[PDB]
Homo-oligomer: A and B are copies of this chain.
Amino acid sequence: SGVKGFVKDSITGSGLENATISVAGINHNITTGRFGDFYRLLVPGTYNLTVVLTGYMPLTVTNVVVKEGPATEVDFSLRPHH
């Protein structure tokens, strides 16, 4: 279980590599892959996720809900500072 999906540029729709995904209260980050893909493994619960990449506004999405069972599919669209 956890949160799965893609981090993408909100302007182009391109998947963004090297974006850092943080979970509030948990000192363990992950980074997106070459297609913008990620899968953050978490036990079921509610979490606040922050996604950061140089050149983009930081994105915080609150109260994201991880269930028992399959990963919660969530994409994150990062806004360039531009």
Q: Is the interface of A mostly helix, strand, loop or mixed?
A: strand
Q: Is A71 within 8 A of B54, CB to CB?
A: no
Bound-state CA distance A27–B2 (Å) is 12
Would you call A82 an interface residue if the criterion is a C-beta within 8 Å of the partner chain's C-beta atoms?
no
Question: How many residues on A have C-beta within 8 angstroms of the other chain's C-beta atoms?
Answer: 26
Q: Would you call B54 and A4 a contact (CB within 8 A)?
A: no
Whether A52 contacts B39 in the complex (CB less than 8 A), given A4-B58, A58-B4, A71-B58, comes out as yes
Q: Mark A12-45, 1 if CB is under 8 A from B, else 0.
A: 0000000010101111110001110101110100
Residues of B within 8 A of A72 (CB): none
Residues of B within 8 A of A60 (CB): 70
